[PDB]
């Protein structure tokens, strides 16, 4: 029975936690008896990937995840998704799903609200070739494929961006609003600007591809310098 399986999982998890507690306490007591100060040292407890019980982040090994970033709870990354330095995907209350070839800029924060009205997902879903600038904030928003969001942009709950939409930097998308496909929107309250051209679309595609390549180079260099754990 599923309930029995869950109960067994909880029991074994608690036993493991108690075993860890006693082991660490014994090590500390041994240090105290041995006049060893190793235990006392204060070192950052930050964990890049933190799993809530039953909510473990999942990502393809091809993805580049900045060691400065932090993935928490139910997070799902695509094939070559790149997460910038210092960006946090809390995804603890609900899940966060990302596409194959998206780029998340540095200092981007993604966190979803507790609940929303009927028919509105309470999880962040991002397209395949999305490019999100540094300093952006996202909450329970849906973004389709081939979407570029400018730096320092705020996207609130229930907001849907269709394929090809572009949002200028330093603009906010009010909660529960639609950004149609192939249009440019700017301003703190987003206002229609114009329809995108093929040249601009190609430039955005090239920009996101360049960001993916830069992420690959960063991953290689960090692995070389031992700053990246070989998962």
């Amino acid at each position: 029975m599923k309930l029995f399986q869950a109960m067994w999982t909880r029991t074994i998890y608690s036993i493991g936690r108690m075993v860890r507690e006693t082991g660490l306490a014994l090590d500390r007591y041994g240090c105290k008896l041995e006049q060893d100060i190793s235990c006392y040292e204060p070192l950052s407890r930050h964990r890049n990937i933190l799993p809530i019980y039953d909510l473990v982040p999942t990502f393809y090994h091809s993805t580049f995840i900045a060691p400065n970033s932090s993935l928490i709870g139910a997070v799902y990354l695509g094939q070559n998704t790149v997460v910038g330095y210092g960006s946090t995907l809390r995804g603890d209350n609900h899940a966060i799903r990302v596409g194959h070839n998206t780029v998340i800029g540095d200092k981007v924060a993604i966190s979803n609200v507790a609940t929303l009205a009927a028919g509105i997902p309470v999880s962040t879903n991002i397209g395949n070739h999305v490019n999100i600038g540094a300093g952006c904030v996202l909450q329970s928003c849906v973004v389709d494929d081939n979407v570029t969001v400018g730096h320092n942009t705020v996207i609130l709950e229930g907001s849907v961006l269709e394929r090809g939409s572009v949002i200028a930097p330093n603009s906010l998308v009010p909660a529960g609003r639609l950004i149609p496909s192939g249009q440019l929107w700017a301003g703190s309250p987003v206002r229609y600007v114009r329809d995108l051209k093929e040249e601009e679309i190609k430039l955005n595609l090239e920009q996101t591809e360049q960001n993916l390549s830069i992420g690959k180079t960063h991953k290689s260099s960090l692995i070389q310098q031992e700053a990246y754990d070989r998962l």
Binding site: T58, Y60, Y76, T115, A117, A175
Partner: protein
């Protein structure tokens, strides 16, 4: 009073309870009946809930 119609029988009711205004968060309207005698969420019998996304990603990673 004439306009008042919390349910959607006479005046259509959005699934999204309200229309959010700019400079405000999107919050559900307070229901007319606020009874808290609610069960935990109910699901169909033999409901499939396996973490298919995680399983597929783990299988691909190998």
């Amino acid at each position: 009073l004439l306009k008042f119609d919390p349910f959607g029988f006479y005046s259509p009711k959005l699934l999204s309870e309200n229309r959010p205004e700019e400079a405000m968060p999107f919050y559900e309207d307070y229901p007319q009946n606020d009874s808290h005698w609610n069960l935990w969420e109910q699901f169909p019998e033999d409901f499939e809930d396996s973490n298919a996304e995680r399983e597929a990603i783990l299988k691909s990673n190998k």
